[PDB]
Amino acid sequence: QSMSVKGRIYSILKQIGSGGSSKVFQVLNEKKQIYAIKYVNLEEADNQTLDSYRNEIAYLNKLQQHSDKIIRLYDYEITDQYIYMVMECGNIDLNSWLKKKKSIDPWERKSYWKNMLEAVHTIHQHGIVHSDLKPANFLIVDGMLKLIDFGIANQMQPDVGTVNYMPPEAIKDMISPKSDVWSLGCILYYMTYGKTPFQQIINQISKLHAIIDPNHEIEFPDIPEKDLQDVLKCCLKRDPKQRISIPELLAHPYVQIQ
Ligand SMILES: COc1cc(-c2cnn(C)c2)ccc1Nc1ncc2ccnc(NC3CCCCC3)c2n1
């Protein structure tokens, strides 16, 4: 099987993942260079979701120049029937990497964190809040973490969702850049303690309650990296006004001092 995108032929090596009407394929161009093609079957798409894809593609194209921490979008084809996006192919997504890894290098964790702050910070500058950040939104490419999507179009899984990274303010509102800080904090906590802050809570209703309860104290076990522990405490503050900002996270010793 092979596909054509803007007159360029790509042979499919394998399907990396499938989400909804969208599929991701590892592919090779004529020169044998590797790429990831995202295929979206628009045949059963509503004007709201169709628009979301248009918005996601526009931002992705727009944010190309601003940061290298955002996945490369080389080309794309849009028709009433389908969408093809030619993107750089990464080794693996951060989620699948974390599920696999028995332990994580302190340097790698710090480097990955920095990449994440840079990518997320970039989208914030353009007025975009992902609001659905999780490890699966990050791709490891060349030992570097890149943001795959901006939370506008539907998420994909390799070949079920989670409320583990949800900020308290999102639950209570029944969403500002601080909401992404909470989620990034949950990712870092996971990379630090091998679990998310509320993973232990099996009962989902209880979990949401734990997330919004001031009296529920998140555990921050002592570790050699005292700066890392402070980052975690500052990202996981329930009051978004008191929660640390990305610009402040970028001036933190944890990311500045080595
Ligand atoms: C080598 O190829 C890959 C393998 C895996 C992998 C390995 N083991 N497991 C369990 C997964 C994950 C990712 C990649 N590479 C990749 N490169 C560019 C992408 C552009 C958009 N979307 C992607 N994947 C979406 C669907 C997959 C999850 C992330 C979102 C992309 N995935």
Side-chain angles (χ1 to χ4, degrees), residues 2-7 9-22 24-29 33-43 45-46 49-98 100 103-113 115-141 143-156 158-159 161-171 174 176-201 203-216 218 220-225 227-232 234-240 242-257:
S2 168
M3 44 188 163
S4 179
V5 193
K6 292 278 191 65
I9 311 296
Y10 302 86
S11 37
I12 297 152
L13 285 178
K14 65 169 189 197
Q15 164 175 339
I16 301 168
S18 65
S21 53
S22 313
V24 192
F25 301 104
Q26 186 174 32
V27 308
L28 293 176
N29 67 355
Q33 298 175 295
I34 206 160
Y35 297 93
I37 291 177
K38 188 171 175 162
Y39 164 62
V40 189
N41 178 82
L42 300 168
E43 303 255 83
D46 49 297
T49 65
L50 178 54
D51 219 36
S52 64
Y53 274 98
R54 289 168 178 162
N55 204 252
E56 172 90 45
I57 289 168
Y59 272 114
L60 188 52
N61 213 31
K62 170 74 177 304
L63 291 213
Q64 285 307 280
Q65 327 88 42
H66 298 94
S67 180
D68 56 316
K69 297 307 180 298
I70 293 178
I71 192 177
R72 296 299 85 190
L73 173 63
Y74 295 106
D75 219 346
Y76 60 91
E77 191 166 310
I78 319 187
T79 73
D80 285 333
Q81 305 88 46
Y82 63 77
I83 299 185
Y84 288 137
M85 293 156 73
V86 186
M87 307 175 281
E88 66 181 322
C89 186
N91 294 74
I92 186 175
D93 68 289
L94 180 66
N95 187 51
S96 305
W97 185 74
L98 289 172
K100 184 187 271 183
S103 289
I104 189 171
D105 174 8
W107 186 95
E108 207 170 16
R109 174 171 56 229
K110 192 180 281 217
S111 190
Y112 281 177
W113 179 241
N115 294 161
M116 286 177 262
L117 291 178
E118 191 193 327
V120 174
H121 183 226
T122 304
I123 76 183
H124 287 168
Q125 287 179 323
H126 294 78
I128 308 170
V129 175
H130 193 287
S131 84
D132 194 50
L133 289 166
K134 50 205 171 307
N137 293 110
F138 295 97
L139 186 62
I140 292 169
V141 189
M144 179 179 309
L145 270 196
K146 298 199 188 193
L147 184 61
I148 298 162
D149 63 78
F150 297 168
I152 302 147
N154 310 331
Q155 180 76 18
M156 308 190 66
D159 308 323
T162 175
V163 300
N164 282 327
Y165 310 82
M166 198 173 301
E169 64 267 31
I171 302 145
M174 277 140 169
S176 80
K178 295 290 181 75
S179 297
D180 286 343
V181 169
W182 173 282
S183 301
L184 286 170
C186 289
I187 299 161
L188 186 62
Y189 187 101
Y190 182 7
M191 292 197 291
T192 305
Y193 300 119
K195 73 155 196 84
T196 60
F198 306 92
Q199 182 170 316
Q200 72 279 0
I201 309 120
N203 193 296
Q204 305 301 304
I205 305 71
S206 290
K207 210 203 275 284
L208 296 182
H209 280 101
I211 297 169
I212 68 151
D213 188 5
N215 304 324
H216 183 289
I218 304 185
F220 294 97
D222 285 3
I223 50 166
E225 291 167 286
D227 290 335
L228 178 39
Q229 215 180 317
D230 181 76
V231 165
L232 294 172
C234 289
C235 295
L236 300 174
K237 280 171 178 175
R238 279 175 183 93
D239 186 346
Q242 292 302 296
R243 188 178 308 150
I244 197 164
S245 68
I246 300 284
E248 263 152 18
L249 281 159
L250 290 163
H252 201 281
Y254 176 63
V255 58
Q256 289 302 320
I257 298 166

